């Protein structure tokens, strides 16, 4: 995704 931590 565009950023980390999204799952």
């Amino acid at each position, epitope marked *: 995704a*565009g*950023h*980390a*931590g*999204a*799952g």
Partner: antibody
Amino acid sequence: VQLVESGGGLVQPGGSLRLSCTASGFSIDSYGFSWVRQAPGKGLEHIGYLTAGGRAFYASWAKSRSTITRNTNENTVTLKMNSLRAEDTAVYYCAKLGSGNPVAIWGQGTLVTVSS
Amino acid sequence: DIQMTQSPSSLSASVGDRVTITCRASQSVWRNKNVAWYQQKPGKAPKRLIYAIASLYSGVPSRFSGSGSGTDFTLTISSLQPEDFATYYCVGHYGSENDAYYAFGQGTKVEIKR
């Protein structure tokens, strides 16, 4: 598209700061938002990041005192930091940092002075 | 935990010179791409110039450019102008699917020789 910041100002040591940023022209739930601070004449320091999915991750130095939340109903994101010391005096910003994406939004910043 | 080291911490250059600022990451950034460059002028808020290592924001003059790979990144001002006096920061994004962090470099003050 705007991000208006509110709160802060003069806070006493050992007290707490509460800062909010109200989105206008979009919904807070659609982007991840960081909180960053900058002491007078120093560099930028990252506090914590609230992903678009609602998960909060904090830098180590800030983990024990910081809480970052968001209210989808009021369309706002909020930082709370307690046990404040003079070392916490800084300009605080809410910001989608846009490290790898074309979208980047910053609040105007607000100086928080920790003093009695 | 995560660190980014800029160099130099300050520099002095003349109008028209080419300025290079490097930023060194302690780990790999997210997707080897989430690195942005910011510019802060006196009394102003930081303004983003570059994102995704090398993408120029539409509001920024084209004499700014980004480059780099792996954990070493570079911001380049091709022809230095007086209004380019500022402190420049790299910012990196890090973590995994269950971790998300940002880290700023300590900043590079660019002074104008005159």
